[PDB]
Amino acid sequence: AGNLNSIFQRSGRTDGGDARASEALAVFNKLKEEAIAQQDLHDDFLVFRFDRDQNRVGYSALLVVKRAAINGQQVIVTRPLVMPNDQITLPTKKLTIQNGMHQETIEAEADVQDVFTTQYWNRICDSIRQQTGKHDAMVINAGPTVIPADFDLKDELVLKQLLIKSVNLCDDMLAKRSGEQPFSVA
Amino acid sequence: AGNLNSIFQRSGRTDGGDARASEALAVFNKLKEEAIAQQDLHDDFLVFRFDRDQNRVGYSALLVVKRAAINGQQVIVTRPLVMPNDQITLPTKKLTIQNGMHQETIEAEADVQDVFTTQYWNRICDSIRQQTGKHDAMVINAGPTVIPADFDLKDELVLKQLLIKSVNLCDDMLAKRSGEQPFSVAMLKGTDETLAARLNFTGKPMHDSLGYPIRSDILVSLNRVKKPGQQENEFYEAEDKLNQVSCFVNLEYTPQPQLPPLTPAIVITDVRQAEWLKANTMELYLFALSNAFRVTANQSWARSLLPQLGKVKDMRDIGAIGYLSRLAARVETKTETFTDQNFAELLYNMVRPSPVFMSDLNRFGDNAAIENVFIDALGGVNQQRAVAAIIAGVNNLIGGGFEKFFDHNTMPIIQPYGTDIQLGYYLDGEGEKQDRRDLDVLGALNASDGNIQEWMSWYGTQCNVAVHPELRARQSKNFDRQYLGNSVTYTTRAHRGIWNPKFIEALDKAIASVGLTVAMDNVAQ
Amino acid sequence: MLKGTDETLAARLNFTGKPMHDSLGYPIRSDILVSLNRVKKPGQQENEFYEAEDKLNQVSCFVNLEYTPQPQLPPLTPAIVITDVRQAEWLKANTMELYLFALSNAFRVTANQSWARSLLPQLGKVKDMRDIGAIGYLSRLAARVETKTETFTDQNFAELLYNMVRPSPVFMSDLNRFGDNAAIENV
Amino acid sequence: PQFGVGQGSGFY
């Protein structure tokens, strides 16, 4: 499929994917707009979707993105928010364990540390670049987080704060990249 | 009078449009915006209302429109969505039938085939230019389709999906005009990857973009090209499918001047790529067609004729075949004494061993941008161009060489079947939609309960094409009311044709001959 | 642009007993609607691909009566009053040329004696206002003419007109500074 | 018996 996707993903779009992830994207878009209206946040950032049916992901995620051109380099900074779902079965690792004289296998669902692999990160890089248009940009990992499966999406306050904090972490990483003067005892 | 459109349209705007085109525009604009909000759709394009009032068509439509300039030319790709309105009657056409020495005229309503004339399209193009400002633009026909009057417009899910699919196709056609790279066996032929395939004896129907059922006896599934031992793509889960072809097999009662009386007419009703792939091109279509060939070439389609033993309500029960055979009776297939061996014997005496491959062709179907080349390839002013496009599509799949199997100018790719197809659906005892095509030869024999004279009247209606099609359509509808029921809804009509056996030989052998080997999953029956 | 080699015009005079409404839904009095249509030869027409109508324009007229005693002529001098001028709904533009072409529709309302049909009695009305029988109050009779009943003849009607109404009406119009045609009517 | 042709595009 990957050899074909190179070009047959370019033409046309589809619907689908995890409904919880769609709800999460929608509540963050709502909160984003409320924050802009109340001047808690500037309208200078984008939120993208990272999703199952497009990227073969394991866990879906929302991506908070800031951009800057630093000394000629286009830089994208992002902070993913991973979304587990209690209604979705994930593939397991087959863990073969040499228990004394006999090997037994325990299977376990991949956790967020098993899913967010270097390559998962590389697909985040590429997905954002295609959604921002900055195809040759460098991408900074501002440190991902998780929005666990278990709970009501009704805590708009928490979600608003996660967005604000994600934006701030993204700004600090661009600031580091640009040489912002360090904190010091001075 | 019609030339006063040059004055009528010079300035200003008006209050107009029919109630369905008005409602349709409102829901489609809503859906566009929600798709953008959910990030499913890109915000690079426009939706337009085409009016029967403001401009020169009998039927209003919405236009799914996308644009780009390609090498200096402004190019627009449009996929019209016709909006039939149950409250609006377009003046009928006079069908004069010369019945030997008797001349009689039947008046009838224009269907989407009669409506979508060359000028209908040209008028669609002109309106778009008025609406987009691109007065010097060229417009690409992605294939008109229709969203029928009958159902309630509140199905936002389907409507969203229609926009999604229609813009997909629009992007493909801008791309293919832009010179985008073709699908090929080389992309599938990893040095470490192989194909495999199976025949699904479904027990269920499949549904088009508006949710209407499509007859299929066998769904051919071509597995994703891959091999055990290849690197696993992280923690993923996916269906191992590349594409599929939907088909059914009838048993036509055919002439002979020693063969048995029935023909294994293998009919393709639909061609789909796996859902994970977005593009819809001729190479993808053509490659998938090989799936139907293998139905009889490697495997045996006849399993689909087995009666549903133990089920009383089998309207196409093979037992009916005894009415065309020398028995003139239904074979008792309800009994514990009916065996697989007896089934095979019925077929040994009744059904011919040589398969015939044919397919539906629909200018208004889900694949209309492509269906149209295969339809024009049947004959007419541009047959040569349509044929050239089709042979080029296969050569793109194989890297050339289709021409090493046969001459396409001696052997046109698709022949006409003559008797065309009335499409529609009927409701079953629980109110579900079922394909009207169920009254096929076995179906019709059970429907008349062995009354061969009633069967033959119907059968001649479906075979003698010296009879004007209106006369045939009227009798076909009369037969559905008596045998299928009055709960029958008719939908957009379609063409049928026969795939040239040499086209088939070349497609199947050319793919195999370049190393894209496919294994059969049903290794033995 | 109208003189097609395969196109001519034709017209109809409508005598229906119903009003027109203006741009905000208010009633307009008229007796006769003059409708001018485009008639084409039955060959190939653009409308083979669509539902179509032949209306080009319309002029709405009221038939008045001016009382002109001579202390002889029939005492009432009729007039054709244009109460509205419209283009067919197919044409978005409203210009001086279009207005003037349409005005010829009022002229033709007086062909023969067609305009005088507006002076007829009509079905079953027990007491209603446009009854010609009222004319008997100005005529020698000094009485309402019994016109609404089964004993009134076509001949008696013709006689009321012969003695009371002059056969050739005056053409006139109402120009509204605030109407939809005001840009033109103001000229 | 005859084949009508509509206004197809892209492939011709």
Residue numbers in the entry:
A (entry chain C): 19 to 204
B (entry chain A): 19 to 275, 288 to 555
C (entry chain B): 205 to 275, 288 to 403
D (entry chain E): 591 to 602
Mind quoting what the paper says about this structure?
To protect themselves from host attack, numerous jumbo bacteriophages establish a phage nucleus—a micron-scale, proteinaceous structure encompassing the replicating phage DNA. The ϕPA3 PhuN monomer is comprised of two connected domains.
Flexible termini and large loops mediate adaptable inter-tetramer contacts that drive shell assembly into a largely p2 symmetric lattice. In keeping with the p2 symmetry, each PhuN tetramer forms four unique interfaces, two of which form channels: a Diamond channel at the center of the core tetramer, an Open Hairpin channel and a Closed Hairpin interface forming the lateral contacts between core tetramers, and a Loop interface where the outer corners of four tetramers meet. At the Open interface, the tips of opposing β-hairpins (residues 111–126) interact with residues near where the C-terminus leaves the structured acetyltransferase-like domain of the neighbors. Keeping these hairpins apart creates a somewhat narrow channel, measuring 31 Å by 41 Å across the corners of the channel. At the Closed interface, these opposing β-hairpins form direct lateral interactions that close the channel and move the tips of the β-hairpins closer to a structured loop (residues 245–258). The Loop interface appears to be, in part, held together by interactions between the large flexible loops (residues 272–291) from at least two different subunits. We further show that the lattice assembles through interactions between flexible loops and establishes a negatively charged interior surface for the phage nucleus.
